[PDB]
Amino acid sequence: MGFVRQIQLLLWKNWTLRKRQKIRFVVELVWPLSLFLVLIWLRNANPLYSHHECHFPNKAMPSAGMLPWLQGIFCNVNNPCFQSPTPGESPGIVSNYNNSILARVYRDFQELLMNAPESQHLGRIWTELHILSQFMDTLRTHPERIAGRGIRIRDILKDEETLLLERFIIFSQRRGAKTSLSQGTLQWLYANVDFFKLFRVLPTLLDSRSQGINLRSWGGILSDMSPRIQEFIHRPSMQDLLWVTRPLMQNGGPETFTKLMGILSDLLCGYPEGGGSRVLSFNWYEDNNYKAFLGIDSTRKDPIYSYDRRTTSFCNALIQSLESNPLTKIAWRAAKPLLMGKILYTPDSPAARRILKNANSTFEELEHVRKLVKAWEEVGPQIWYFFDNSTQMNMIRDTLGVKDFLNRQLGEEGITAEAILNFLYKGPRESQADNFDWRDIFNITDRTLRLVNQYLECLVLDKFESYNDETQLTQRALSLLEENMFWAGVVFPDMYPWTSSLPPHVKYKIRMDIDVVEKTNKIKDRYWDSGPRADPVEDFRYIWGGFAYLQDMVEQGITRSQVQAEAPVGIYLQQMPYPCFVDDSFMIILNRCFPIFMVLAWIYSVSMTVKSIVLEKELRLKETLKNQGVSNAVIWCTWFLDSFSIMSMSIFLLTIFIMHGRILHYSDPFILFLFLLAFSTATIMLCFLLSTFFSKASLAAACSGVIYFTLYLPHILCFAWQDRMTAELKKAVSLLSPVAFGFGTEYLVRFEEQGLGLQWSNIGNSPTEGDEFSFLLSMQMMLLDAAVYGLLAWYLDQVFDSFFEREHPGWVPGVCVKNLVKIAVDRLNITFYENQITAFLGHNGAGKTTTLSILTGLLPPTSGTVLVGGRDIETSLDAVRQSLGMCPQHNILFHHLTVAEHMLFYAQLKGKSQEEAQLEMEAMLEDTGLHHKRNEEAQDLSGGMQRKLSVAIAFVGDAKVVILDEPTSGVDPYSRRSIWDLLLKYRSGRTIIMSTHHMDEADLLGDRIAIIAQGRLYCSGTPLFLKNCFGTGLYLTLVRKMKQVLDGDVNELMDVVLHHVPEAKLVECIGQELIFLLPNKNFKHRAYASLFRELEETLADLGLSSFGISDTPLEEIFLKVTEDGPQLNTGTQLVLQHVQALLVKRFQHTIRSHKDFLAQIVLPATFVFLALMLSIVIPPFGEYPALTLHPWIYGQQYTFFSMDEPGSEQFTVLADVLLNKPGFGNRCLKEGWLPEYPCGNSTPWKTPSVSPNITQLFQKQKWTQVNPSPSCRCSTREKLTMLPECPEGAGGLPPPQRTQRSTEILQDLTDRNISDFLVKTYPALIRSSLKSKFWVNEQRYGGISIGGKLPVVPITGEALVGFLSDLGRIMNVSGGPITREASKEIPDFLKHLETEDNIKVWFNNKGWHALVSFLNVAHNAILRASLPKDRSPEEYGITVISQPLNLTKEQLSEITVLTTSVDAVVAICVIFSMSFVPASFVLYLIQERVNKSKHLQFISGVSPTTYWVTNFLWDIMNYSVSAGLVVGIFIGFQKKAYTSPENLPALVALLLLYGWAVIPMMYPASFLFDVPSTAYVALSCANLFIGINSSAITFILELFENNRTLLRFNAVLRKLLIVFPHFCLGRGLIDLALSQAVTDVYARFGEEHSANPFHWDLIGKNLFAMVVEGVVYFLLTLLVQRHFFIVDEDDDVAEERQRIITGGNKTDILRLHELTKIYPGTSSPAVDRLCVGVRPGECFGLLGVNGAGKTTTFKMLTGDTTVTSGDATVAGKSILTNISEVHQNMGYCPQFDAIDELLTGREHLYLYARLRGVPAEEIEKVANWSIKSLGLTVYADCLAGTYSGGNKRKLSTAIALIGCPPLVLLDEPTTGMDPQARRMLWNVIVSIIREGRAVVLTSHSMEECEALCTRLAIMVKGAFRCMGTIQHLKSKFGDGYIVTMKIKLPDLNPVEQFFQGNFPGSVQRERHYNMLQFQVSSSSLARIFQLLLSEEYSVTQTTLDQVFVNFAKQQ
Ligand SMILES: *[C@@H]1O[C@H](CO)[C@@H](O)[C@H](O)[C@H]1NC(C)=O
Ligand SMILES: *[C@@H]1O[C@H](CO)[C@@H](O)[C@H](O)[C@H]1NC(C)=O
């Protein structure tokens, strides 16, 4: 035998079959690639974002002064990222602003001019210049000497002597004023007293009032200070200042608002490397925008514009020109509520007033500036006056500057001084001379300072308004907020309007709207992003929204109201640094789309494999191969390798595209191949399992892809609960292989993120930190699911005188049976011989099927043995199957396999090599007469030659024994002979056994016969022996002609046979016939011989046409051995009878069917229920929670601290109330604070332990201060990692730790670099905190750093007004009323600009509320660090709450969109669920359109209108029940908008009209589908493609308020899609929810809205469109159905001329003139002209040559198809105009069975009785009679459809015979009836004809058509070739008189010679041993010339089927 040869063979056939398909083959290799191209377009549409490190500057809170606060607002607007650590994140520094040119200028100034060891002596000059021009230069009132007065006084006095003088005066002074040394002394009675003082030209002795003199103590320093000043101007700092300020003054310089900001930035900020980078965000889905990516613009409407009361005419023009200008319009929107907003402080009481008094320092300090600027309006004119008309300016430097000694002093002056210009630019008034450098420096300062003055008064700086309850606050809040003038509103909940003293725990709320606050639902991003979260606009709403500034101000006030410390500390916020990173947005969609695409790419290749496996099992092609000797395992193992080699060829291309398409960049392309392979191997063994469920191929092909897809959906639910999925639930759910695929895909993507592939090294491990489910478990569980599926499918497949005769010794008995019994076969003993055909009879299986089974070898015997060549089968079960051939009743052929391939396959399977197999095939193709069309497909053969091939296969190889049962069943009489030729040819050397039931076939061929009576041989022998063993006489037939009234005179007919009358005579006389019956017995050759002889010449005299003399039928010899006009309803009553017959017909079918009760009821309810249940997992959003802000709302976490600046006081207690008992924050109060977060117990400081490798690394190696512990590898060029690699080189050693009794873990970072420790240990934290990528917590959120100081301004307060007042007094100003108050606050104004001793807090922006949670901790420790030393600071605290401000009807205009978008999906679920019932109603119509049941209804007369009307009527009422169940489920869920006393009518009407309008829509789909399953799965997809893409597009398309073409599309689709009801139901179920939302936001605040449905605005036009299209479609289905609905032979002449020219019907029933049926056109009509006529009492035959075209005659006669101008009439009317009047006078028995397989036998009769007549009380008796006539009473109540094989045919012949029609059409009314059953039908069909009712018959056999027909007509390609009776036609178109005789040691020499009398014939036909067949002539002379023989004899007439072969022979 073989085991590896069968496999080669089966592989060959399967490979050859999977080549003639060529459209499954192409799809199975192209569809996956067309599915993975989109996944490459998505790779290229989602690029990659990387960035370097980020170090961020810090932000000062108001408590850190005002100058740092405002400078930090302006400098850090964009929050820059700096790549290199900022100067403010150092241990002792906080400032962060060197390198501003305005600080370097100051440093240079203070360095070289000030602190001048050289001079430092301008103090002397100032003291002298002030002591003179304050005391002496005035002299206005004080008294003096002779030479003393205010302005001009002389000295001359005290002279008693009377008075060259001009010469003396000129010598005294040289052009000198009152404001020389010796010349007059040597020229000298005047030198006695008149020279009282020698005070000569020496310049310093005049002011000797009290004490003082100094002359050249001015120039010695005035020439000192020059070169240093010049050098200072030559420093680079002043160079840069002057350079930068060159624009910004020249001509429209500041216009670009990037030059201006650039100048200001380089001047005030100092930031390096360009400024910074501005990291971005890219999320939009944590914020629910849905219009950030969609392109819509998202702005609130700009607020109301109203002129205000008491602001200004400038502060109303600006607010408008700056707001309605669509270029700024947004910055202003954000900045306005801060600088003109307003703050509201509900609990108006003394204590809150004190808090808000102390919380007000910032605005006070900020109006101290407006006063100082208003003072210029007063001091301006005074400076003007002093510099224009003064006694000290133009009277000391313009009226002077001596000018002669002054000129001499100027001669030694500097280079560029210009005393002339120093006089022109020092008092020129009435000049208008011009530069001018004098007044263009003063009018400019006015123009630029009064402008600032009139800008600064727009700011509102009094903004605390009180109230008394929260409701009034909220009312004023929305009133202001619609104007854009609202800051927060503060609420002190636990105090009363009479409270006076503060409790030692104060809490408050900040209530702001939601656009400037973080949402209080979420506290994290749901999906982790790998980015710093440092975007200035979306990620910092607690800063530009002003929440943090107000929080700081109020906490400072609360502290200051109960501590009285008078030593402040400010707060700086610092953001923690972040490492390098890459952000890939593909890895989000890869992780979700890879498994979907992979599962969806095999969805077709799975179904087309279950299809093949089940189909070849449905054609019984598997039990054939199992009988032939093939084990089941080989079958499966070949199926596996068939399916495997196409998966394995598509995988090879998937790998290439995935790798080289850059979907995966670096991942070892061999492991991915070997990973997809396991999925394919599990999939195939799933197909093996799925096949063992189904029994019909078409159903499996549809239900299998659906199961494959459904099995994957658990991964959706396992992609949410990633948290509570342990290791075991991964090891257990992963038995479903498609989820084990996704569980490995996630590790694939997680590895690809890290910069690593899989690389054969990490697949066994996991990056998920000890989750013990590696990547290998996925592979190793798919390769286990395969084994489980295979080994479950295998088992589940398994579970499902004498009578015998003398036998010549010259015969070799090949097969011999020796008493085999089984329990059936009682003492059976027969021998089948060598070359001989044996016809093995027996009724059905009483001894035939059982015995043939053993002879074949299937089953063993019970008692006896069998020999095949002398060797029992039970002993040689295998090698005996070498000779046994066999063929079963059905065909054994493979579709798509050519004929020669069949011969080769079945030759080689028996055991042969290709050589001999090919040789034998070539011999067989020549012996079989199929050498032509040898390479044709096994289908598409004629159908008789399919049987010819199926019986030629049983002979293949060397078959010594052939068993074949009914080889010729069901082929036309011309193909039976073609088959018989084969058997008569291969008969030569092998035995053949031939079970059959055709009785003539057992005789025309067959050499022995055996009859199995009741389990035993009851006869045997040759046919002649059997005829003689029973021996009844001859059958003389006599046929009379006509001249109607033909003939019929038995008087002269019986008289002729009365002379030799034997025994029984006339046995029949049917119309124009005269059958007889006579014995043979006692030879009497002369007697008989003389009869025929004499009759021959005396024939034409009597009137007969001819005569025959047949023997005894073989069927009659086997038959006796086995076990032997009511009136009709019509009219409206008839129609009211039809409409009640059909309803009962459908009702009785639905009760008994349960596969209806599924798709009619169960599925709708379950699917809508699931939709609803997954619709309410979302609650009806309230307003917003409170969310007390404290740092434990995050999980376990690490905090830190850092005592910078130690030893100092107030910091060693601030560092202790923060670590020790009171702890961080506020959780541990002695009393309360949220008894949900408990307090525990602390542990001592404990440094962790370190690997020795590290400790060796640090002390041995030499590090630095700028380069501590080693760096981290960043993304290079092709190894882009998500986060850097970071070796065992973190910040350094682990620092001390602890566990605060809060349960946090703080670590002490004192004396260490923090921005090195934090950037390098972050990845090692979030690698252990990742592993899910949802709701990660990061374990580190903040820490404090106590210390930092910025150097404050050095000059004190009063020391500045002391100087300013003196400067004023020296120049006559004296200020006024405003100035004397602007100088009041100047000593307190300078202590509030900076703080000098202040802390900083570090925050991690990846947790949303973590800024204001640690700001509170800081402000909470500052309180406890300063309260008096006997109050136990464990009790004090402050807590902040948030609570946003109620939404405003436009905020909700988007929560509505986000809320109704789930109801827009429940609507699609409802449509998809309800579109199952109408698709179930259509499968029934398809089932009746095929199998011709509908046509059968129509023939009886059901007038298609009433058929369709009754179907629609039943379908509506059947659908109403499911609709009512859906209404019940909505009422149960009690939802609003659908089940409310005004939404029930809308919902119910909307549900009912849907079915009403959609049922008639899908009726036309019943005319173009012929397989129910394909129709179901092609309607369930249209009712989805039209359900989604019509209900959703309008919804999505309404959210575009612009483009003016999107609305153009929307408003016209909403009118163009109203043609079909899926739209009319989607736009109804969505609108009934939108209206509810809109009428439910109103009821939130007062507004009333009571809109109703049924109003044509929402659901009126829908309910109209449904009613109209529920009728137009129905009329369409009433029309799509209305479109559907020479010479001749010498015996055809009589029928030609009977009714054409004579006209002779006058009583006939089927006048049927020349009818012709021409197709559109091929050559000629299939039916040509034909004339026939049927009399009342005879059965027409109408045989017809097969294929020539006969069925078309019945099609025309039954109205099935259309005639081409014929003429056919029935008894009273015609066939062309009154067809409904001729379809009640005829039955019709279809060739194929047309019965509903769910009712029963009896109610088919009930139905068809009702469909025609039979009033109500007679149906009972009519149906009773019909059941017993045909013999059905045993089975008459057992669901036709279980009826075996002939009860169906009996039923069809019963219902065709109901009532009493005068015409009956029978089409092959006996097909699978055993030979006893046929008689019980033929008797009936003769009983009718005896009554005068005609019958037209048709059959493939020539037996029945000979048994009960009275005339025939053979049809050939034309019309006719004969008419007349049987006997009349045998002779007129045949020959015959076969003669047989046994030669009584026999020899056959003398017989041939003695046939000397009979030469014209004698073809001899046979001779085995002594039997002699012969065809003599037809003169019946043999009967007289046989009485001198030489034993037995016989002379029969040729059979009727010999005539048919003769007619069909020529064609
Ligand atoms: C501005 O200053 C100039 C001095 O250059 C003076 O003449 C003039 O009156 C001032 N006012 C105006 C409006 O120019
Ligand atoms: C801290 O409290 C007590 C101290 O008496 C200690 O025994 C206990 O184990 C610690 N933890 C808790 C939760 O009490």
Numbering used by the authors: 1 to 163, 209 to 224, 231 to 239, 244 to 456, 460 to 492, 496 to 861, 915 to 937, 945 to 1164, ...
Original paper wording:
ABCA4 (also known as ABCR or the rim protein) is a retinal-specific member of the ABCA subfamily predominantly expressed in the outer segment disk membranes of photoreceptor cells, and was the first ABCA transporter that has been linked to genetic disease. Available evidence suggested that ABCA4 may act as a flippase to translocate N-retinylidene-phosphatidylethanolamine (NRPE), a reversible covalent adduct of all-trans retinal (ATR) and phosphatidylethanolamine (PE), from the luminal leaflet to the cytoplasmic leaflet of the disk membrane. Here, we show the molecular structures of human ABCA4 determined in three distinct functional states by single-particle cryo-EM to 3.3–3.4 Å. These structures delineate the conformational transitions of ABCA4 to flip NRPE and suggest a “lateral access and extrusion” mechanism for ABCA4-mediated NRPE recognition and translocation, a mechanism that might also be adopted by other ABCA transporters.
To gain structural insights into ABCA4, we first determined the structure of WT hABCA4 in the absence of NRPE and nucleotide (apo ABCA4) by single particle cryo-EM. The overall resolution of the structure is estimated to be 3.3 Å, allowing de novo model building of ABCA4 for most of the protein. In addition to the polypeptide chain, 17 sugar moieties were built into 9 glycosylation sites on ECD, which further validated the sequence assignment. The general architecture of the structure is quite similar to the torch-shaped hABCA1 structure in the nucleotide-free state, which is consistent with the 49% identity and 77% similarity between the sequences of hABCA4 and hABCA1. The discretely folded TMD1 and TMD2, each consisting of 6 TMs, contact with each other in the cytoplasmic membrane leaflet through a narrow interface between TM5 and TM11. However, other than the limited contact areas between TM5 and TM11, all the other side surfaces of TMDs are completely exposed to both leaflets of the lipid bilayer in the current conformation (defined as lateral-opening conformation), a unique structural feature among all ABC transporters and first observed in the nucleotide-free ABCA1 structure. During structural refinement, two clear phospholipid densities were observed in the cytoplasmic leaflet within the TMDs. The two phospholipids (PL1 and PL2) were found in the shallow pockets mainly enclosed by the cytoplasmic segments of TMs 1/2/5 and TMs 7/8/11, respectively. Since the presence of PE and PC molecules in our protein samples and the phospholipid head groups cannot be distinguished at current resolution, we tentatively modeled these densities as PE in our structures. The R24A/K672A/H1017A variant, designed to disrupt the PL1 binding, displayed significantly decreased ATPase activity, whereas the K1371A/Q1703A variant, designed to disrupt the PL2 binding, maintained a similar ATPase activity.
